[PDB]
């Protein structure tokens, strides 16, 4: 067989220890899921420094906590715009998830509050900027470099799926690099607590699994498809399915005929053919052995999963950081006022926030 006695016993023990960890993690999540925290600060506790990102709902700003000097990333959502865009439930769910989860690669929610106009989520500041930036800067990641990041995503999805959370928003734009070179996941607006199937069309074209595009329902295995897309893009520098227009991307995905750069290792191509598998009875992560088909794949043979979890592995890239509050790893965005109306807006829609 592939393992002798000692190796088999060690692997078996490791796998059973994961089950034991996850059972405790779920118990802890469910306590916080049922009793969320709220209203833990106010706007005038913070100085606004710089906008780190903007989107249709709001923006994310680097802020400094006046009393302590600590820097944070504050997401500001305009209540009226959230209602207009039909994102009330996504917004409330994102906050509920962030305050209940706990994992080293999931961003921590430090404070939250609201006022007449806006909702505020004060999160850790992750100073290394987006994986997207770093990937496009150097073109492609060598396989060990890609594998270091991929391993963190595998562990994060193992954790989330144990909580019955499907993630659905993976892409390099949505992954941040911390001062130690490890990945932080921040966005939970598309996440859903799902014990079986779900149907929503959501995500980014290049990262959509075939069964999201198609009308059929789907399950947490869409996240393992998306991991395949991420690993491919990290190691190639471009994603496996692209075209000028989304409808043409979708056609390629549902064919699922994937071609690889000539520099990909055979181990990498085998892993990716098993993640980018259109047939759900064959896709790694969706079989009887679950996540262990991925974690025990040859491409991951050098990965020490516990050491990654303990953040004891030296990272391949350490961002440059010139001092507290440095934003040199982020793009520049237009700076707009933070207006707070004299009148309360959309109060009843956002009571739970």
């Amino acid at each position: 067989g592939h393992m002798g006695n000692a190796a088999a016993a060690k692997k078996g023990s490791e796998q059973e220890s994961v089950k034991e960890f996850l059972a405790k993690a779920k118990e802890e999540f469910l306590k916080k899921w049922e009793s969320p925290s709220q209203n833990t600060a106010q706007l005038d506790h913070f100085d606004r420094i710089k906008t780190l990102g903007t989107g249709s709902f709001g923006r994310v700003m680097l802020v400094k906590h006046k009393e302590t000097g600590n820097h944070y990333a504050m997401k500001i959502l305009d209540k009226q715009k959230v209602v207009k865009l039909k994102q009330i439930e996504h917004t409330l769910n994102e906050k509920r998830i962030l305050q209940a989860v706990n994992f080293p690669f999931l961003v921590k929610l430090e404070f939250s509050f609201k006022d007449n106009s806006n909702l505020y989520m004060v999160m850790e500041y992750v100073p290394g900027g987006e994986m997207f930036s770093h990937l496009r800067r150097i073109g492609r990641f060598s396989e060990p470099h890609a594998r270091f990041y991929a391993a963190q995503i595998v562990l994060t999805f193992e954790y989330l799926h144990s909580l019955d959370l499907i993630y659905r928003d993976l892409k390099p734009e949505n992954l941040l690099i911390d001062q130690q070179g490890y990945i932080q996941v921040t966005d939970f607006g598309f996440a859903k607590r799902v014990k079986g199937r779900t149907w929503t069309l959501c995500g980014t074209p290049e990262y959509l699994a075939p069964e999201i595009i198609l009308s059929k329902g789907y399950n947490k295995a869409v996240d393992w498809w998306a991991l395949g897309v991420l690993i491919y893009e990290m190691a190639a520098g471009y994603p496996p399915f692209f075209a000028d227009q989304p409808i043409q991307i979708y056609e390629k995905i549902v064919s699922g005929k994937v071609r690889f750069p000539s520099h990909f290792s055979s181990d990498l191509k085998d892993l990716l053919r098993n993640l980018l598998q259109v047939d759900l009875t064959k896709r790694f992560g969706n079989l009887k052995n679950g996540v262990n088909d991925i974690k025990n794949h040859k491409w991951f043979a050098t990965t020490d999963w516990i050491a990654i979890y303990q953040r004891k592995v030296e990272a391949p890239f350490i961002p440059k950081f010139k001092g507290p509050g440095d934003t040199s790893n982020f793009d520049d965005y237009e700076e707009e006022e933070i207006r707070v109306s004299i009148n309360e807006k959309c109060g009843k829609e956002f009571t739970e926030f």
């Binding site: 496009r136 892409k171 995500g203 980014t204 074209p205 471009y238 692209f242 075209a243």
Partner: peptide, 19 residues
Amino acid sequence: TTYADFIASGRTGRRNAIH
């Protein structure tokens, strides 16, 4: 090449979600 086709697609910058 595939990479040149990627550049020609115009989808080399940050990609938006469908909604």
